[PDB]
């Protein structure tokens, strides 16, 4: 197993992870090497396929030209997985477009074929043991899984020996339920992976640990004091949103309802949905209406970024912020959501000043809505710092970068490469 920890049966939460020794804030509970992993398409050329190292001068694979490595060693070590896609990419050409989930599942089947025995990634929980929630699956989800299976057969039949359809539905359900996205220091999507021992940890909206990544290695560090006998909880989702929203996402994606202290007490819900202090206070139904509108624009925008222009997206942000501002405070999380999206759009257009402008409005409410140590907060400080630095504002930049470092030392560990890079950024300028 894993020192100082154990698997146990958590009442009403199936299997979980329990502490057998004390852990202090910033302490490393354990590490877990990726069982299976895939670099996201948009990051190819920026990161090594095999180890996810971010570097310039990465060597291009001579056959497909769509995989990049640190060196010949990374290339060679990655080949057992990359061969599933190398020739297929050139053959299908423009038609090669499997979803990330399919790519990961293909790699899972490949690993199962090469290494059927228990791996060092499965010291407490095996991939085969993953919870699937197959029985809870509705028509929409079964249809999505079937599409995924069809894509799997479509692009990966060359090297894979498929089980029956039923087992593939089980596998895909397990992947949706237990899979992790890997993000960088800015919380930018890097890829997807399976970390079986890490997936043992249950969810809480007030978690006592955070998961970070060191290449393809998952790391789990305490963000709260943990005492022997206490269950170890991580957050599966963005904790910015109020209780109802959080539970809608947890129910939809993970088929459960959280009963943590935050969901029960609902302490932060009031401040999260802060209402303007108007002479004539807004009626209850007007609040419910604006909240409904807010969720609708969130979904609408989600769709719009796929085909609308950057100016249209900014228009949606500005106009929606304008409508919401009559009822909602600037510190309101839906306002913050639109501001964050707008910041992202500004960043894409290389409109640095506008992005800084929004981020400054975003950072403090983030600090108040998120838990004490939050990758979202650290990441926001980091973005702000890099914008200030890029715009020649070294004192403000140094201050924000040091705030980011201060959180990340706890979450990533004092010796993490991301921190060395940030310190290098401070010293170089």
């Amino acid at each position: 197993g894993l020192g100082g920890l154990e698997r146990f049966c958590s009442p009403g939460k199936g299997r979980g992870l329990r502490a057998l020794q004390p852990f202090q804030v910033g302490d490393l509970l354990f590490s877990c090497p990726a069982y299976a992993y895939v670099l996201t398409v948009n990051e190819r050329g920026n990161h090594c396929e095999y180890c996810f190292t971010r570097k310039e001068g990465l060597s291009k694979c001579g056959r497909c030209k769509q995989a990049f490595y640190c060196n010949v060693e990374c290339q060679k070590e990655d080949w057992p997985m990359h061969k599933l896609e190398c020739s297929p990419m050139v053959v299908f050409g423009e038609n090669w477009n499997p979803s990330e989930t399919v790519r990961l599942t293909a790699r899972i089947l490949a690993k199962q074929k090469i290494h059927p025995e228990r791996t060092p990634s499965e010291k407490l929980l095996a991939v085969k043991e993953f919870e699937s929630h197959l029985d809870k699956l509705d028509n929409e989800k079964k249809d999505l899984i079937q599409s995924d299976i069809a894509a799997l057969h479509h692009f990966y039949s060359k090297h894979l020996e498929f089980p029956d359809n039923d087992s593939l539905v089980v596998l895909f359900a397990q992947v949706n339920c237990n899979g992790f996205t890997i993000e960088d220091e800015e919380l930018s999507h890097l890829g997807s992976a399976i970390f079986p021992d890490v997936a043992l940890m249950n969810h809480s909206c007030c978690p006592n640990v955070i998961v970070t990544y060191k290449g393809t290695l998952a790391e789990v560090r305490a963000v709260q004091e943990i005492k022997p006998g206490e269950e170890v909880f991580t957050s599966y989702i963005d904790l910015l949103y109020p209780t109802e929203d959080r539970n809608d996402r947890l129910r939809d994606s993970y088929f459960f309802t959280c009963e943590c202290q935050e969901c029960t007490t609902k302490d932060k819900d009031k401040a999260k949905v802060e209402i303007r202090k108007l002479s004539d206070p807004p009626k209850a139904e007007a609040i419910r209406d604006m909240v409904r509108y807010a969720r609708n624009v969130i979904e609408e925008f989600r769709r719009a970024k796929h085909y609308k222009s950057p100016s249209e997206l900014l228009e949606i942000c500005e106009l929606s912020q304008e409508k919401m501002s009559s009822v909602f405070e600037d510190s309101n999380v839906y306002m913050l959501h639109m501001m964050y999206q707008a910041m992202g759009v500004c960043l894409y257009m290389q409109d640095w000043e506008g992005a800084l402008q929004y981020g400054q409005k975003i950072i403090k409410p983030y600090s108040k809505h998120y838990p004490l140590y939050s990758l979202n907060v650290a990441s926001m400080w980091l973005k702000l710092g890099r914008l200030y630095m890029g715009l020649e504002h070294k004192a403000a930049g140094e201050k924000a970068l040091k705030k980011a470092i201060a959180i990340m030392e706890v979450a990533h560990g004092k010796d993490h490469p991301y921190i060395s890079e940030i310190k290098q950024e401070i010293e170089s300028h």
């Binding site: 989930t101 949706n176 992790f180 996205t181 993000e183 919380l187 999507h189 989702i237 963005d238 979202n376």
Partner: peptide, 5 residues
């Protein structure tokens, strides 16, 4: 999948 954002 499991992400903070």
């Amino acid at each position: 999948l499991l992400s903070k954002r």
